[PDB]
Amino acid sequence: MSTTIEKIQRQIAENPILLYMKGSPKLPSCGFSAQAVQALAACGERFAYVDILQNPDIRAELPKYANWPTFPQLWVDGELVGGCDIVIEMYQRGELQQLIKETAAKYKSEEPD
Amino acid sequence: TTIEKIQRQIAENPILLYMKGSPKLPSCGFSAQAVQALAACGERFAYVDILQNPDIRAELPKYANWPTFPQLWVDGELVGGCDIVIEMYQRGELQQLIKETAAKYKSEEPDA
Amino acid sequence: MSTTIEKIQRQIAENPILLYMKGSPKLPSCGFSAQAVQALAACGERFAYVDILQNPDIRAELPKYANWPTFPQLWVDGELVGGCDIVIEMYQRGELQQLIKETAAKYKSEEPD
Amino acid sequence: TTIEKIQRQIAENPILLYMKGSPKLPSCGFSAQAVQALAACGERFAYVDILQNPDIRAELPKYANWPTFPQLWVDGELVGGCDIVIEMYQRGELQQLIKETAAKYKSEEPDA
Ligand SMILES: N[C@H](CCC(=O)N[C@@H](CS)C(=O)NCC(=O)O)C(=O)O
Ligand SMILES: N[C@H](CCC(=O)N[C@@H](CS)C(=O)NCC(=O)O)C(=O)O
Ligand SMILES: N[C@H](CCC(=O)N[C@@H](CS)C(=O)NCC(=O)O)C(=O)O
Numbered sequence A, C: 001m002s003t004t005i006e007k008i009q010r011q012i013a014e015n016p017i018l019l020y021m022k023g024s025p026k027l028p029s030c031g032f033s034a035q036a037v038q039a040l041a042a043c044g045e046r047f048a049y050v051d052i053l054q055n056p057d058i059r060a061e062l063p064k065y066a067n068w069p070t071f072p073q074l075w076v077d078g079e080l081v082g083g084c085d086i087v088i089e090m091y092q093r094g095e096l097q098q099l100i101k102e103t104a105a106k107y108k109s110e111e112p113d
Numbered sequence B, D: 001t002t003i004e005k006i007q008r009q010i011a012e013n014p015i016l017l018y019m020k021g022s023p024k025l026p027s028c029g030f031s032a033q034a035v036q037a038l039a040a041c042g043e044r045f046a047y048v049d050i051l052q053n054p055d056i057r058a059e060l061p062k063y064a065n066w067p068t069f070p071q072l073w074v075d076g077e078l079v080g081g082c083d084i085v086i087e088m089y090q091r092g093e094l095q096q097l098i099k100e101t102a103a104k105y106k107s108e109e110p111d112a
């Protein structure tokens, strides 16, 4: 344990669809992060992001915690899906759309109206 | 205009590194490696963090005819990216170019 | 000029569809090269490759000649198309298929039969 | 079997680097950087070129629970990849671990 592992654990436990990336969804800082965020966002459900370029503690500690050396990282329902290559392949096959749709449905409570 | 800004930058800084993040705080390992080799050459240099200058990030690639960052520019010419810079350092070429550039730019006429 | 630039120029002038990559099409040595070769090959036309991991002179000199720091590189009819990201996007849009089909047609002479 | 081979490797080599290419001739800059930091620590080490061992390339990721190369293994444990190794070197931690490992492995009982 470190306080930063504790922080990451909260983020992952509290956000069922979570993308750690370089930059933000509106202004990505790396093509790998841009590609991943485009495919994720196209699934049409709410997602949370962390810009690891503004969070040096997470940038340093997450790779070892995740057993995954790189960014971006998509975590869905507490599990690491993978990085850019994985996320875009899944989108290409239609599988990302299904995972994300079912995840948002599992955690849906209040509805706009 | 963004191109004019870029043109001046290249014109006014004899050793100039476009990179992601800053030398103390790189945002990409390619930019980290390039700045570390350059810094090792012992001469002052200028950098532009292209993540804080979205216009430059967007326009420099086509201006430079070089698609990526970092980019090292010396005496108004593109030297290359991370892989070029680190090989030059290994071969001792970068040290030479950087020494030569800094000394040529500091050189003055005798006083009188 | 160097003798290696001369060699690269011949390769590009003599091979209308040419992929410089890490490893070979049957045994790629890097996911970027694997992805590019898969998309290219799926276009269904003859292509030539150079494994730059067996050609240190080309690995050293091509990036500066190409104005393109990385591998893989797809060259079509003497022009650099780009690397992995470009080639797969083009395949995704159907544009790679058309470029490659028209290129093979332009250079076709003898036919099997 | 490929896993048994891997298990022995890790068991029999206290400082072990799985990489692309060899230390004199890396096939990837990530592998080049890791070997250069490791070599700088002053101790002998072993490497496996995973581009000449397709079975290891394929199987080690799931065995290691670490998807990529290079991978540095020390005293039977995974230290990490390129980014971990180069940061450890910068902080002086890698030097310590590598010195400690080599000395512990060379240590002998008094003669008698
Ligand atoms: N193959 C990609 C590559 C991702 C990647 O290479 N990320 C690098 C460059 S942005 C990285 O996160 N390095 C660690 C760091 O900069 O902290 C993927 O599937 O996600
Ligand atoms: N092969 C390296 C790597 C540099 C690189 O691949 N940069 C990429 C990723 S940081 C890039 O700038 N892409 C354009 C962009 O992100 O704006 C070199 O020699 O410079
Ligand atoms: N974004 C990719 C990246 C290609 C890439 O990063 N290639 C690197 C790693 S294989 C490279 O060729 N480095 C120069 C070298 O190893 O000689 C593309 O579109 O092609």
Ligand SMILES: N[C@H](CCC(=O)N[C@@H](CS)C(=O)NCC(=O)O)C(=O)O
Residues within 6 Å of the ligand: A069, A070, C029, C030, C031, D020, D028, D030, D057, D067, D068, D069, D070, D080, D081, D082, D083, D084
């Ligand atoms: N972020 C680096 C880079 C290492 C890396 O991204 N390796 C990739 C490209 S060489 C890889 O081994 N992919 C699996 C494979 O090619 O077998 C690290 O910390 O180790």
Ligand code: FES
Residues within 6 Å of the ligand: A022, A029, A030, A031, A032, B020, B027, B028, B029, B030
């Ligand atoms: S910021 Fe340079 S490769 Fe991602």
Ligand code: FES
Residues within 6 Å of the ligand: C022, C029, C030, C031, C032, D020, D027, D028, D029, D030
């Ligand atoms: S061989 Fe390592 S990124 Fe291509």
Ligand code: NA
Residues within 6 Å of the ligand: A028, A029, A030, A031, A032, A034
């Ligand atoms: Na981007």
Ligand code: NA
Residues within 6 Å of the ligand: C028, C029, C030, C031, C032, C034
């Ligand atoms: Na591959």
